[PDB]
Amino acid sequence: TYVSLADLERAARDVLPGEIFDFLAGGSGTEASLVANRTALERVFVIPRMLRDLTDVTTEIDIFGRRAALPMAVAPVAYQRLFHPEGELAVARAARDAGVPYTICTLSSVSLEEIAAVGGRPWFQLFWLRDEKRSLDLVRRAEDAGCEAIVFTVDVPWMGRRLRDMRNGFALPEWVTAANFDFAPATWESVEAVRAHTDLPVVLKGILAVEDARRAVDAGAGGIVVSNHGGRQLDGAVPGIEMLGEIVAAVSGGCEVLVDGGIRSGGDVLKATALGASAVLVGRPVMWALAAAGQDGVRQLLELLAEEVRDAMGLAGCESVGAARRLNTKLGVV
Amino acid sequence: TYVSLADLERAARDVLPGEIFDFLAGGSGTEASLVANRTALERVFVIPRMLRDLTDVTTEIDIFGRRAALPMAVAPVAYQRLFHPEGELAVARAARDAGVPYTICTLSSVSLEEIAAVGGRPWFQLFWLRDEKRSLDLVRRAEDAGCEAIVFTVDVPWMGRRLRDMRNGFALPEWVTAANFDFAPATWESVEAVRAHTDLPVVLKGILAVEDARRAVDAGAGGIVVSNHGGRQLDGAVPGIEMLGEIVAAVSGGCEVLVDGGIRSGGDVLKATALGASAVLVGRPVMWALAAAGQDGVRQLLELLAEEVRDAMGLAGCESVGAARRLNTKLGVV
Amino acid sequence: TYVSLADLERAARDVLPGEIFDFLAGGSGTEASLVANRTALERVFVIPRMLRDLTDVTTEIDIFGRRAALPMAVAPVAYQRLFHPEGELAVARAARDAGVPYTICTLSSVSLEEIAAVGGRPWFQLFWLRDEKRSLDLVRRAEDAGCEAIVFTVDVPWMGRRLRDMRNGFALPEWVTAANFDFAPATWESVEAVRAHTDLPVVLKGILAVEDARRAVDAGAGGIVVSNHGGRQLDGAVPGIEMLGEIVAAVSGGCEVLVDGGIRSGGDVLKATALGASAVLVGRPVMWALAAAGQDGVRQLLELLAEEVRDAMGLAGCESVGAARRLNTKLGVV
Amino acid sequence: TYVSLADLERAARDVLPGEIFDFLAGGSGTEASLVANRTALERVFVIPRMLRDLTDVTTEIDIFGRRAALPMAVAPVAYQRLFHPEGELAVARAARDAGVPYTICTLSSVSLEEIAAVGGRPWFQLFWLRDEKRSLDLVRRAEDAGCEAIVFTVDVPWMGRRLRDMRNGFALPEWVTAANFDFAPATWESVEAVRAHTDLPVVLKGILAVEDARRAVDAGAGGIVVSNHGGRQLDGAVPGIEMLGEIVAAVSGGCEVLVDGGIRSGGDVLKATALGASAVLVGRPVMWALAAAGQDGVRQLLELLAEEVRDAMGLAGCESVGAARRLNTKLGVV
Ligand SMILES: Cc1cc2nc3c(=O)[nH]c(=O)nc-3n(C[C@H](O)[C@H](O)[C@H](O)COP(=O)(O)O)c2cc1C
Ligand SMILES: Cc1cc2nc3c(=O)[nH]c(=O)nc-3n(C[C@H](O)[C@H](O)[C@H](O)COP(=O)(O)O)c2cc1C
Ligand SMILES: Cc1cc2nc3c(=O)[nH]c(=O)nc-3n(C[C@H](O)[C@H](O)[C@H](O)COP(=O)(O)O)c2cc1C
Ligand SMILES: Cc1cc2nc3c(=O)[nH]c(=O)nc-3n(C[C@H](O)[C@H](O)[C@H](O)COP(=O)(O)O)c2cc1C
Ligand SMILES: O=C(O)C(=O)c1ccccc1
Ligand SMILES: O=C(O)C(=O)c1ccccc1
Ligand SMILES: O=C(O)C(=O)c1ccccc1
Ligand SMILES: O=C(O)C(=O)c1ccccc1
Ligand SMILES: O=C(O)C(=O)c1ccccc1
Ligand SMILES: O=C(O)C(=O)c1ccccc1
Ligand SMILES: O=C(O)C(=O)c1ccccc1
Ligand SMILES: O=C(O)C(=O)c1ccccc1
């Protein structure tokens, strides 16, 4: 029995080898951006509304042509077999059963076709490959397998400096591989190549500048994820939650605006929604649940988040996620 | 001998079973809103006035047609027999003797008629029941028993997620019951039903949004309590003290504006007054005093608060609570 | 050898009985205003100027018709025999020798005439007595003894709630008495009575509201001390340093504007000057020095402060205190 | 193997005598300005750009007529033989090999001619001497030896009060001397004398006021270093990083604007650049590396900083330092 996401972190910390826990937990550099993701959420307070009709409270949203049970998707996290032997299959099954989109990674430890076969209308996260032709072939594989959106990660020209991994001498165990294989930096030209190659919605993950959000809309993106990559890329990058309101105003409904980084409760989902997010991604907590108890762990996490989201929405007077987006917020201290 | 409200918390902590102390102390979720109630008060500084006539300093106010000895009432707190065998009767007797209004709860552990028989011109807190007819019958009981105001709690469509209570497996002992009995979410329609059923002032407790405060006035409320329910309802709800000034400006004398959450001294009462509150509610400290020493404990607490309020008002140059409302404040750090 | 004021606090803490140290160190209530005096100074940063002529750096000021060696006076502190057997005489001698004004207290433990006989052109602090006639007789005594200013304390209608003193059961030892004797709250009428009774400058100590500063000028005050009484009066009163800039702007050279509360270095004196203060008062540190080493201790403290003030002024490009008043500041964090 | 600058501080702390470590680490007074240099950087967050061309990322700049490999120079630090027997020669050799300017000190423990003979196009830091003639002779020596800029330190009319050094009784060992010899306060007249005596760019180090930055341009300075001297001069001086943006706007390209104080990573270099700095100086970390491992230590530090700067720039979408200067920032908390 878990009553908060923090219960799952404690359980994952028990079970995982230290170096693997550090791979999961860590950020780049001094971990300033990692810590700031939490600090930034903790400073946001919601102004709830009272006395509204709550006879049909629903946490559902429509996004990228699909109904989702919550305004949430599982974030792309590479190499999930590091955390449990069933890896991506356990997580994708739990996500499917919960009605939550699952993001299949370019660096998945089980092939994208196997994970897509689980069902649940999955998304696919793209890292740009050595050339256009191979990148587009990977997009086409994902589309052929029934993925419903391409989440193009745009904040990784290369991987950040993860000092925990350097100090630990961390490397993949021989039994964990990039199962989609037997990279070069993305540009706006890469985005255009992807957009022309698929009719699936293209979602740019890792946008923080307002003008990059605008340009994403102009480039034909169906969504963006406002994100500092969980503090794993540029150390000192602003948290996504701190740019979200400005970005939502700037795109002016031109694309879906998601956010990630440090979402650890249904209350945090509500804060994100109140700042204007269409939905959130959740990364580390899903992996804690996977490490702790496999598929059943992830199921319990998603059930817990669903109850927390419903609870927060109703206490704030919101019968729908749209209503939650119209909530006001106030910044506080600590 | 107690010289601060904090002396009473230490005494209550000694005597109470852990699970009962946690029921009393706790908040919802991560307890962010619970902590913020204190943080928010600690950031407020008063700009005192000097050299004013203090020859007849009075802490009295007129509210809901009654003189009160202090700008304070005892907050509604369910199930007071959890804290002392005399429960609500001990607290109501001490409040009566101090000239402070006592709020009788829907979930009182002694019947509202018994508590009202104590005297002291009590108020009645309403939770909306399964239907209109039963809710209105409860209002009529309170009115028939001589209650002078209906404090309609509007922030509890359901009870929040209290993780201390979940972790402790807390439940009422068999010897504590809801003595008014042998609930459904409130709406603005419920408010209207209550307003039409009684000539008593209706006070909406748990308002945080400015437009909800305005709407409360438009709905015929005689007062509101600006409140996040002591951090026990929405985790991440703004503290009432942070919304109070804006709300006072918006209602523009159209109803009484009370505040609660974290009031722990006469100095805090002064801060609330200087931000525009008509009066405060005090919850947890009253229960600490009850746990520590029964009726006499509550008497000592109210005597201590009375002396602190008088002290703070005079040091700030205020011969009346009205003068205290005209004090200016300045936000500081930590 | 002491190299900071903090060295003196450690020495005083060694020697003094605990209850006496607490009488000296403590504030009212939760000590929020006591702590805030320090916090507020620590948030202020100076923008120093470079490359100015420093060939005749002087820390002198003219104030209330007298040259002072530093922009500083010893604050009124009652009952100095609590800290050392020579009490006020030791402090007044050291102040005289340093060229710093000494404020003789109404509640001095040596008679005001004895302390004035030390020399050094002293000031006299007044508490308003039971009636006008006795109050004015005390003012006349001070004037007859050669005091040069009347520092009328206006923030003590009564003494604040000092919880350390209550918890310790603190009372004066039989060997410490109010030597000026064998009180009622001051008002603006009291100020006028004093102003009409003496041609000495009347200085109102304990002003925090801007309109009280204006009114002080209109009332014929020669100065004010912007002060929360070292956090010993209203708990939650804003620090003087936080009101100082606004007050200086409002009085627009109409009277001298001093500040006190938490001045613990020459750097802090510079901050106060840069915010517009004419001079500061220093309280607790003078008593630490007295406790630690009597007259010689106070001499060493004043020599240390003189060197720190000279150092700070020159490093900031200021050849005079007037130049220091023209420095700009910037608020920072922690 | 060092993966952060903090690894080098730990190593230096191991090896150095305590009093020498304190000479290096310490600041003046309470060390408020020392701590604030770090706090101020930690509050700055970068808004990175995505999807830009990074096929030729370069960290090079042109400054004072020379290409530098990074937007960084080694700060002037007196008496480097305190930290390692090779002192300035070890540091200058490593700087030369890394393509980073090295600032030769007036108070170098090896003669300026010997250090200049190392090569690498060095700068020379000037303290104003007892008269104009001797000061100008020192400038001429530096110029004759091939120094390329005169870094005139303008924040040291005298040295600040370093309480660690006072408490330790610190003095130079007999084997460390001011090798350029067998001082008076600088003014704007001194600056003019230097400017007329050399065609080398004159760089004023220790500017914090906006009008001093303007005046520096008007005086013919080729650059300024916005700096509080690592918190070693005025205790309470604003950090340079907090004045940098305002100063950059005010000089409006009229001179190079460098900053120092607390730069401890390539991420911090990026923050400085994004606030408008042309380049940074790095002081203490270079000495940590020197203490830890001599010339090879300094080489490793500069290689580490080069990799961190390249990493941060690319992750932020900047192919050049000019692009980094066009990044936006956002202030956060803690
Ligand atoms: C171990 C780990 C691996 C990750 N791998 C990827 C990846 O392959 N692609 C990607 O776009 N994001 C990746 N992310 C970033 C997440 O998608 C997400 O942005 C971040 O974890 C969200 O923050 P949260 O973990 O605080 O919920 C990874 C994060 C972690 C912790
Ligand atoms: C144990 C407990 C029970 C409570 N029960 C009720 C209730 O039945 N109805 C209600 O409107 N508020 C209830 N409250 C909220 C209080 O009325 C009040 O809003 C809150 O406690 C004020 O904060 P304070 O405790 O910080 O003074 C309760 C609070 C506590 C701590
Ligand atoms: C032990 C003690 C006694 C004091 N007595 C008096 C007094 O008799 N009259 C008065 O105007 N202020 C009195 N003060 C206040 C000081 O004059 C001054 O406002 C305060 O101490 C300044 O702060 P500092 O102690 O932080 O320097 C007293 C302060 C202390 C600590
Ligand atoms: C031990 C030490 C000696 C210094 N000596 C000088 C000096 O002789 N001349 C000068 O202009 N600055 C001097 N500085 C200041 C540095 O040039 C620089 O402004 C400061 O150290 C930059 O901060 P950082 O150490 O945080 O990188 C010295 C600093 C230290 C720590
Ligand atoms: O994307 C990531 O943050 C990440 O940690 C990673 C590192 C190496 C391979 C794949 C993902
Ligand atoms: O940093 C890298 O080289 C790396 O492994 C990578 C991973 C994913 C996308 C781009 C680069
Ligand atoms: O109102 C409350 O906060 C509360 O704690 C409660 C919980 C259960 C029943 C009654 C009150
Ligand atoms: O959460 C509940 O179901 C509950 O017990 C309750 C209590 C008071 C009012 C409304 C609901
Ligand atoms: O003025 C004071 O703060 C003070 O502490 C005091 C208390 C009693 C008598 C005199 C002064
Ligand atoms: O609080 C008091 O009664 C008190 O002792 C006093 C002391 C000085 C001035 C006014 C009152
Ligand atoms: O410039 C300095 O900060 C410094 O520490 C110093 C002190 C004495 C001599 C030379 C430099
Ligand atoms: O403070 C001093 O006297 C000192 O040593 C010095 C050092 C360098 C420049 C100016 C003064």
- Alpha carbon distance C281, B13 (integer Å): 43
Task: Indicate the residue of C40, C187, C233 with minimum beta-carbon distance to B53.
Answer: C187
Catalytic residue, candidates B93, B205, B229, B299: B229
Q: Which chains touch B (3 or more CB pairs under 8 A)?
A: A, C
Question: What's the angle, vertex CA B127, arms to CA B126 and CA B133, rounded to 5?
Answer: 85
DSSP B199-247: SSPEEEEEE-SHHHHHHHHHTT-SEEEE--GGGTSSTTBPPHHHHHHHH
Strand positions, DSSP E, D128-283: 150-153, 202-207, 223-226, 256-259, 279-282
Domain range for B319 = 5-326
Q: Which chains touch D (3 or more CB pairs under 8 A)?
A: A, C
- Cβ atoms < 10 Å from Cβ of A185: 19
Residue that has been written with the tokens 């918890």 in this structure: C167
Residue A332 resides in a domain: no
Q: How many CA atoms lie within 13 A of D196 on its CB side?
A: 9
Residue C35 burial (C-beta neighbours within 10 Å; 0-12, 13-18, 19+) = middle
Task: Indicate the residue of C48, C314, C334 with minimum beta-carbon distance to D237.
Answer: C48
- Cβ atoms < 10 Å from Cβ of D156: 19
Task: Quote the ligand 2 centre to A327 CA distance (angstroms).
Answer: 24
- Alpha carbon distance D220, D137 (integer Å): 20
Residue B296 resides in a domain: yes
> Token pair of D331, please?
């202030």
Q: Would you say the CB of residue D125 lies under 6 angstroms from ligand 4? A: yes
Task: Indicate the residue of C39, C163, C233 with minimum beta-carbon distance to B3.
Answer: C163
Residue that has been written with the tokens 């009981």 in this structure: B141
Q: Do residues D185 and D135 lie in contact, with contact meaning Cβ atoms separated by under 8 Å?
A: no
Q: Do residues B73 and B100 lie in contact, with contact meaning Cβ atoms separated by under 8 Å?
A: yes
Please confirm, yes or no, whether C84 is among the known catalytic residues: no
Does an H or E element contain B256, and which?
strand B256-259
DSSP A258-274: EE-S---SHHHHHHHHH
Query: Among D178, D182, D20, which Cα is nearest to D109's?
Result: D178
Alpha-helical (H) ranges within chain A are 5-15, 18-25, 32-42, 87-98, 112-117, 132-144, 163-168, 188-197, 210-218, 240-251, 266-274, 284-315, 321-325
Query: Among A180, A205, A42, A259, which Cα is nearest to B30's?
Result: A42
Residue that has been written with the tokens 């050898």 in this structure: C1
3-state secondary structure chain C: CCCCHHHHHHHHHHHCCHHHHHHHHCCCCCCHHHHHHHHHHHCEEEECCCCCCCCCCCCCEEECCEEECCCEEECCCCCHHHCCCCHHHHHHHHHHHHCCCEEECCCCCCCHHHHHHCCCCCEEEECCCCCHHHHHHHHHHHHHCCCCCEEEECCCCCCCCCHHHHHHCCCCCCCCCCCCCCCCCCCHHHHHHHHHHCCCCEEEEEECCHHHHHHHHHCCCCEEEECCHHHCCCCCECCHHHHHHHHHHHHCCCCEEEECCCCCCHHHHHHHHHCCCCEEEECHHHHHHHHHHHHHHHHHHHHHHHHHHHHHHHHCCCCCHHHHHCCEEEECCC
- Picking from C130, C228, C234 by the largest number of B CB atoms within 10 A of its own CB, the best residue to mutate is C234
* CB contact (8 A) between residue B50 and residue C207: yes
Q: What is the separation of C-alpha C47 from the centre of its chain, rounded to a whole number of angstroms?
A: 26
* CB contact (8 A) between residue A208 and residue D333: no
Domain total of chain B? 1
Catalytic residue, candidates C229, C264, C284, C299: C229
* CB contact (8 A) between residue C314 and residue D166: no
> Token pair of C193, please?
């009575």
β-pairing, C72-74 vs C103-104, is unpaired
Q: What is the CA radius of gyration of chain D?
A: 19
- Alpha carbon distance D152, D125 (integer Å): 6
Query: Among C244, C219, C220, C239, which Cα is nearest to C228's?
Result: C239
Q: What is the separation of C-alpha C197 from the centre of its chain, rounded to a whole number of angstroms?
A: 24
Query: Among A171, A243, A176, which Cα is nearest to A206's?
Result: A243
Q: What is the separation of C-alpha B85 from the centre of its chain, rounded to a whole number of angstroms?
A: 22
CATH number of the structural domain spanning residue A19: 3.20.20.70
Q: Do residues B203 and B258 lie in contact, with contact meaning Cβ atoms separated by under 8 Å?
A: yes
> Token pair of B164, please?
């201390």
> Token pair of B134, please?
């039963």
With beta carbons under 8 A apart, name residues in chain C contacting B52: 187
- Cβ atoms < 10 Å from Cβ of C145: 17
Residue D46 resides in a domain: yes
> Token pair of A68, please?
């989702």
Q: How many CA atoms lie within 13 A of C133 on its CB side?
A: 0
Residue B332 resides in a domain: no
> Token pair of D251, please?
């000089």
β-pairing, D202-207 vs D256-259, is unpaired
- Note the residue count of chain B: 334
* CB contact (8 A) between residue C314 and residue D161: no
Residue B331 resides in a domain: no
Residue C334 resides in a domain: no
- Alpha carbon distance C313, C326 (integer Å): 12
| Measured distance between the N- and C-terminal CA atoms of chain A, rounded to whole angstroms | 30
- Alpha carbon distance A240, A234 (integer Å): 12
β-pairing, C44-47 vs C328-331, is antiparallel
- Cβ atoms < 10 Å from Cβ of A53: 12
Does an H or E element contain D228, and which?
none
Question: What's the angle, vertex CA C42, arms to CA A242 and CA C255, rounded to 5?
Answer: 115
Q: Which of C23, C106, C154, C158 to mutate to test the pocket of ligand 10 (most atoms within 8 A of CB)?
A: C158
β-pairing, B44-47 vs A328-331, is unpaired
> Token pair of A320, please?
């729908």
Which residues share a beta bridge with A330? A45
- Residue A76: what are its φ and ψ, rounded to 5°? -65, 120
Q: Do residues B260 and B281 lie in contact, with contact meaning Cβ atoms separated by under 8 Å?
A: yes
- Alpha carbon distance A332, B41 (integer Å): 12
> Token pair of A177, please?
């591989």
With beta carbons under 8 A apart, name residues in chain A contacting D328: 209
Nearest C-alpha of chain D: how many angstroms from A29? 8
DSSP B29-79: TT-HHHHHHHHHHHTEEEE---S---TT----EEETTEEESSSEEEPP-S-
Q: Is D152 helix (H, G, I), strand (E, B) or coil?
A: strand
With beta carbons under 8 A apart, name residues in chain D contacting A162: none
Q: What is the separation of C-alpha D125 from the centre of its chain, rounded to a whole number of angstroms?
A: 10
Residue B10 resides in a domain: yes
The CA–CA distances, whole Å, from C94 to C84, C87, D133 equal 14, 12, 45
Residue bearing the CA closest to ligand 3, atom 19? C229
Q: Do residues A36 and A239 lie in contact, with contact meaning Cβ atoms separated by under 8 Å?
A: yes
- Cβ atoms < 10 Å from Cβ of C175: 9
Q: What is the separation of C-alpha B47 from the centre of its chain, rounded to a whole number of angstroms?
A: 26
Q: Do residues B153 and B126 lie in contact, with contact meaning Cβ atoms separated by under 8 Å?
A: yes
* Amino acid of residue B55: T
Residue A289 resides in a domain: yes
Catalytic residue, candidates D229, D264, D271, D299: D229
- Alpha carbon distance C108, C86 (integer Å): 12
Query: Among D273, D49, D83, C232, which Cα is nearest to A185's?
Result: D49
Does an H or E element contain D20, and which?
helix D18-25
3-state secondary structure D26-77: CCCCCCHHHHHHHHHHHCEEEECCCCCCCCCCCCCEEECCEEECCCEEECCC
The technique is X-ray
- Alpha carbon distance B214, B216 (integer Å): 5
> Token pair of C267, please?
């750097």
> Token pair of C261, please?
């509360």
Q: How many CA atoms lie within 13 A of B22 on its CB side?
A: 15
> Token pair of B288, please?
């600490």
* Amino acid of residue A110: V
